Nucleic acid binder design. Sequence first.
RNA 1: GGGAAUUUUCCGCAAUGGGCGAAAGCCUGACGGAGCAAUGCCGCGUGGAGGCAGAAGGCCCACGGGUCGUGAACUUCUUUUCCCGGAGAAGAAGCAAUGACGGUAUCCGGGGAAUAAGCAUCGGCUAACUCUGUGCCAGCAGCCGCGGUAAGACAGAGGAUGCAAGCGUUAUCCGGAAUGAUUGGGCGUAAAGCGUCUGUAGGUGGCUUUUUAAGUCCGCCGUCAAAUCCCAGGGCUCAACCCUGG
Lengths: 122, 84, 81, 199, 158, 124
Amino acid sequence: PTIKQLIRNTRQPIRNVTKSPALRGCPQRRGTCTRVYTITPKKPNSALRKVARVRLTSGFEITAYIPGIGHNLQEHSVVLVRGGRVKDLPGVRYHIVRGTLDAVGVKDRQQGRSKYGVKKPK
Amino acid sequence: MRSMQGKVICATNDKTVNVEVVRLAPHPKYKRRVRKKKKYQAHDPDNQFKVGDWVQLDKCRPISKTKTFLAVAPEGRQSSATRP
Amino acid sequence: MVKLRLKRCGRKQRAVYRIVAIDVRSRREGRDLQKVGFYDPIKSQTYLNVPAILDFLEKGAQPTETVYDILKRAEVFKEFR
Amino acid sequence: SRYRGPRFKKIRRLGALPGLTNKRPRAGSDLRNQSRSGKRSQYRIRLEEKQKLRFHYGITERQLLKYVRIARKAKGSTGQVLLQLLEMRLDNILFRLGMAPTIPGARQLVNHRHILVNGRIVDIPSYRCKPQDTIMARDEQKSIALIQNSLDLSPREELPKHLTLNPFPYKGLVNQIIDSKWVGLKINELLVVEYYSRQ
Amino acid sequence: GFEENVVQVRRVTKVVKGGKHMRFRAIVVVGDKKGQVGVGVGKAKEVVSAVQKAAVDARRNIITVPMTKYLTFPHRNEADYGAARVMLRPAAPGTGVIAGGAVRTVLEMAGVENALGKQLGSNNALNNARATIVAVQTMRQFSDVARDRGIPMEELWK
Amino acid sequence: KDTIADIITCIRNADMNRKGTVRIVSTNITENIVKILLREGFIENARKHQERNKYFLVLTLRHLNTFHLKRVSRPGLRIYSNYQRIPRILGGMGIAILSTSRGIMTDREARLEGIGGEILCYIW
RNA sequence: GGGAAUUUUCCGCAAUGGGCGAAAGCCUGACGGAGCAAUGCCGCGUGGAGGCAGAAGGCCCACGGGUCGUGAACUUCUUUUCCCGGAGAAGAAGCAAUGACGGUAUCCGGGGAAUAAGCAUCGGCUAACUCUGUGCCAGCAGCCGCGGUAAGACAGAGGAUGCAAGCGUUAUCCGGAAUGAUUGGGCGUAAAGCGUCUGUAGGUGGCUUUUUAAGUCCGCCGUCAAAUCCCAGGGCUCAACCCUGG
Ligand SMILES: [Mg+2]
Ligand SMILES: [Mg+2]
Ligand SMILES: [Mg+2]
Ligand SMILES: [Mg+2]
Ligand SMILES: [Mg+2]
Ligand SMILES: [Mg+2]
Ligand SMILES: [Mg+2]
Ligand SMILES: [Mg+2]
Ligand SMILES: [Mg+2]
Ligand SMILES: [Mg+2]
Ligand SMILES: [Mg+2]
Ligand SMILES: [Mg+2]
Ligand SMILES: [Mg+2]
Ligand SMILES: [Mg+2]
Ligand SMILES: [Mg+2]
Ligand SMILES: [Mg+2]
Ligand SMILES: [Mg+2]
Ligand SMILES: [Mg+2]
Ligand SMILES: [Mg+2]
Ligand SMILES: [Mg+2]
């Protein structure tokens, strides 16, 4: 458009759409779990996927996902949350870390062993 | 070049005349020369100036708050009234 | 007061100094206005431009202990006065 | 920071590497697996051309990618200037003279303090030898034997023009800068530059 | 008589009563590596026959590319073909051929070994590839400028 | 409005319709611009006449290339350049008509003269 | 204590610098050093060469074989590193003496392959594949989306690819993104022309000859510290890095 219109600052950038407001920019964040449960995913897929309602120390009440097979978590447990969203579950936008404060590594797991906090066999 | 010219609008006050200065400078993003405006306050102890006149400014030690210039006559002009 | 001393700039356990004239109250790595030499103890090399140094000493610049020794090995004082 | 693995496993798939070892593969194993592989993607072709440099010189991607920056800074034929940096490595020069049967074998001789350059020991296989640089062994009979065994127990390949040899010290000398056509490996340098276009 | 390469293969459908006729759409580029660039499109029920038709259609239209002594373009030029705009510039020796997928092959098969290009419009290989041909046809050597301008080549280098 | 903005177009449209004559307006600036295209070999001939006190000029175009043109410095945005940033259109196949204190000349003639100026239009 | 998370309640004023003193000297948690951490960058290892034929073992098979595999075993060669035993600084400027670091770097001798590789990925983007198990279950996933009894997309196994004392995940910024398009986009129908007109400020503005030189162009002067970036040169065994000059 006309250069006089440009001097009016007709153009501006677009602001960030960051996908983890609860972490407040930090990579991870601790939180106590309030209620463990499962939920049915979107229509094409079908499973009982595991989740956990967490109270982070940053002043945010959110829910996360339980990756891996099997878990020992229950109410009043201290977990460690990271980013990453699960598309199949709407509303879930966080994952917990296995091999941490209270979440233990996945039993009987060899391949992709660092993504779940599991000691190497010896 | 060195000093700033200006128009001498609002010359009502005593021993002082408000002065409007104009300059052109390119826009940094688009490189177009825009006419900007800025006012100042000067003093003429003889009160030899009035509204409608053309005046030049000079630097001097401060006389009061916001009045830190001196009004003098212009140096280079182009009257040239009816030359062949 | 103006003073002729030397600042450190180099690697750990490898000292490589440079002579410079700066104010006293300024820190070791202060703003410089004229660099007037270079020196290290290991290689023992020295350029030590004399025309700039005499300009400050005439104006009341006081060398330090070692800079006095560096200039002492040079014959700058005999031409300074 | 080193391969420490089998080399024929890659030579069947990669190509030919006289620098690594003059030995050759034995078996054209199976027509089945060749039918399994079949064609190749363009990214794979540019990839395999890069891997040949990782073996012929014994270099890492970090160590290699640094040389890419030096070539980009250098004006003219960034692909050619890359080989000028690799061929001038000490590990290649001691090999092309014939003082070792394999470049990994030459890399070991450099690491255990058996060679000196211009009268000084060099414990860096990645040392860049400049023009008019002398390369001699040490005075120990162990050091002298290893190079002497390499120059005596097998035939010798014809040397380049930019390398000499004085058999009385069993030493060498670098004359000038290499030409891109005297590389000891059939290369298509342009594909390598196309691979690092992203980085 | 020379080689060819498939730039793209794509299945197209039909909505006949009983079902759908899934037939292939093959885009083939032909180049001797020494000029003689050709772009063609073919279509058939089978994959092999589609490639053959595109080969004839590509050989049906061949054009030489102007190159310099160092196998580069004489100068930059842009072109458009529908919603497909393609950019081209010369390059230094040893720079290599770098461009999009549809643009890399038609230049790689042409013979230019040092150049660079970027496509600013649609991602269609066909519309982008044809734009390259429109870009190269509109470029010439310095000698062609001299004869059409009446000034020698050395006088223009200044 | 900008005369030269119209001058560059009347020559452009003539090549799209592929005509020989232009009947372009005559001014102190255009006579210098056209004079460069004669020596540079872009136009075969030029010729002057009049119908009123005003004046005009008649050009003679050449008979798959195209006579490309482009304006650079506009009234809404003037563009100047120093000596070190004098352009080089297409490695020399094109030229730039720019106004110096010593009148208008070609960029090549400015490279020898050692003085930059106001680029007005590129040619290729 | 908070937090996902960031260090010894150390040695010394030997050097550098600062304050006091005529001087000797005093003080200096500044500073110079050590220690902890793969936090990052750089560099070197975790063996070289040869290894005829054949065998055990793992996986796969059209059951003939193929692959892991010259890999291993084995034979010689070497010792960065490792262990043992000696020698041993520069840094100090100032006749001599004056060293926290420090018996530190470094050098010589002996022993001997002996002390040393793991992490992710293998549906397409994207380099790299089969088998078993499971049966829209358990679960994967950055996007498209895979799994409902022969799953190259889940888990295990073998094999392969890409990295390498690192490898991956997450978070933050830029790029890709011409997706705010000065360079470099558009408004008939895809998002976009006020319902229309008159007009203030503002923006731009026909031709010709002069004036001035604000903008603009050229030549000189001063300045935009040093460090960093760029080019060259030199010094640490190379590199990172340090230094000189421009
Ligand atoms: Mg007063
Ligand atoms: Mg490393
Ligand atoms: Mg693009
Ligand atoms: Mg005008
Ligand atoms: Mg002290
Ligand atoms: Mg002191
Ligand atoms: Mg005390
Ligand atoms: Mg860590
Ligand atoms: Mg071996
Ligand atoms: Mg693939
Ligand atoms: Mg997985
Ligand atoms: Mg199955
Ligand atoms: Mg799997
Ligand atoms: Mg942008
Ligand atoms: Mg625009
Ligand atoms: Mg748009
Ligand atoms: Mg509509
Ligand atoms: Mg609409
Ligand atoms: Mg109006
Ligand atoms: Mg500076």
